[PDB]
């Protein structure tokens, strides 16, 4: 009856760039979502799945925690049916998605005096992502009829772009640590309960 290691995600000392979310599997443990819900530390706690007050009593075969950092305004893009630079080129939720999205204001930790440029996001892609698709390639993006020779310069862009995160940024431009909890029921006995 070991407690699920949520501290390995929410209390983590390092977070992934939005172009490459760091997924961790949660299994064979006792979940507690009420501690997150009632911490009142989160700027947002919203669900598209079962309401969080009932979610704790519902068992699942697999739970995934995907951790990453985005601008506070970008948080609105993380929902089923949404479009935008993050929703289409970095990560996408399915229309049938069950789960919750939790956001926390990290400006006190992720900001740096010279600015924090260690977080990247994908700016270019040939087509929209499939739900839960992840792409870590760094190949140069072609933006024209002329074949790209793989050398960055003109209509040959590095697909990733750094964030301009700074301590003086307005709230919409401040970094937020965001965790998305995905839930599924496979044809197996449940291993995660609360």
């Amino acid at each position: 009856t070991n407690l699920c290691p949520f501290g390995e995600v929410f209390n983590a000392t390092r977070f992934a760039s939005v172009y490459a979310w760091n997924r961790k599997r949660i299994s064979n443990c006792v979940a507690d979502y009420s501690v997150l819900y009632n911490s009142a530390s989160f700027s947002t706690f919203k669900c598209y799945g079962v309401s969080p007050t009932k979610l704790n009593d519902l068992c699942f075969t697999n739970v995934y925690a995907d951790s990453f950092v985005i601008r506070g305004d970008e948080v609105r893009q993380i929902a089923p049916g949404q479009t935008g630079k993050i929703a289409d080129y970095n990560y996408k939720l399915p229309d049938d998605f069950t789960g919750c999205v939790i956001a926390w204001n990290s400006n006190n930790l992720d900001s740096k005096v010279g600015g924090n440029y260690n977080y990247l996001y994908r700016l270019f892609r040939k087509s929209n992502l499939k739900p839960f698709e992840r792409d870590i390639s760094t190949e140069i993006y072609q933006a024209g009829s002329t074949p790209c020779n793989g050398v960055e310069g003109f209509n040959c862009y590095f697909p990733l772009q750094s964030y301009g995160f700074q301590p003086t940024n307005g709230v919409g431009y401040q970094p937020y640590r965001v965790v998305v909890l995905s839930f599924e029921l496979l044809h197996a006995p449940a291993t995660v309960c609360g």
Epitope: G144, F154, N155
Partner: antibody
């Protein structure tokens, strides 16, 4: 019909700055980089620098290094350029230019140019 | 930086006459990005050829680019009265480029 619309003529004193705008219409601004060039009367075109839209990459020609700044406002689909420490030598017509296509940025050339902005320093 | 040189600086041709403009790189310029432009006084430059080998959309068949390596040219099969203009070329390169050549002027003879 694709258009680029630039701010009208402006006169500045030497040692002061000037700001020039260029607004896109009929085209997704995010689909392409915008570049700037100037032409003094009777002279050949001289490249200043460029900005990749949505990337913030603003590398400049060495001749204008730390003498020009290029920015963009995504909400107005408008490119901006500023010059500092102006000299009477800088009197010229300044132009913005871009590629034009729809969803795929297919054209590698510069299909659309603005009407140009006259800047006089004296 | 890539420096381009063009010749003749001034040309004099009759209407209906075939015309050629030439450009040469100061150094072994990479690939082919020598796009060509046309300009009239009081007006912005307009794209004719991109890739030094392909016509821009809406460009008449008489215009065509050519050449390779350091040596690039622009040709017009026959000059129209409308075609008398100042011409330029630009090298997009791998960035840190986009230098323009000195350009050429074509006058009516």
């Amino acid at each position: 019909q694709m258009q680029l619309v630039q701010s009208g003529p402006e006169v500045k004193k030497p040692g002061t700055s000037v700001k020039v705008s260029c607004k896109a219409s009929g085209f997704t601004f995010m689909s392409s980089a915008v570049q700037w060039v100037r032409q003094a009367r009777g002279q050949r075109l001289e490249w200043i620098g460029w900005i990749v839209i949505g990337s913030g990459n603003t590398n400049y020609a060495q001749k204008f290094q730390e003498r020009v700044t290029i920015t963009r406002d995504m909400s107005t689909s408008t490119a901006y350029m500023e010059l500092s420490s102006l000299r009477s030598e800088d009197t010229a017509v300044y132009y913005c230019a871009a590629p034009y296509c729809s969803s795929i940025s297919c054209n590698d050339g510069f299909d659309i140019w603005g009407q140009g902005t006259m800047v006089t320093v004296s | 930086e890539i420096v381009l040189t063009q010749s003749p600086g001034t040309l004099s041709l009759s209407p209906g006459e075939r015309a050629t403009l030439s450009c040469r790189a100061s150094q072994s310029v990479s690939s082919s990005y020598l796009a060509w432009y046309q300009q009239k006084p009081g007006q912005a430059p307009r794209l004719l050829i991109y890739g030094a080998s392909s016509r821009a959309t809406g460009i008449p068949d008489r215009f065509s680019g050519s050449g390779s390596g350091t040596d690039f040219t622009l040709t017009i099969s026959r000059l129209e009265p409308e075609d008398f203009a100042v011409y330029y070329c630009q090298h997009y390169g791998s960035s840190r480029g986009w230098t323009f050549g000195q350009g050429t002027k074509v006058e009516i003879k």
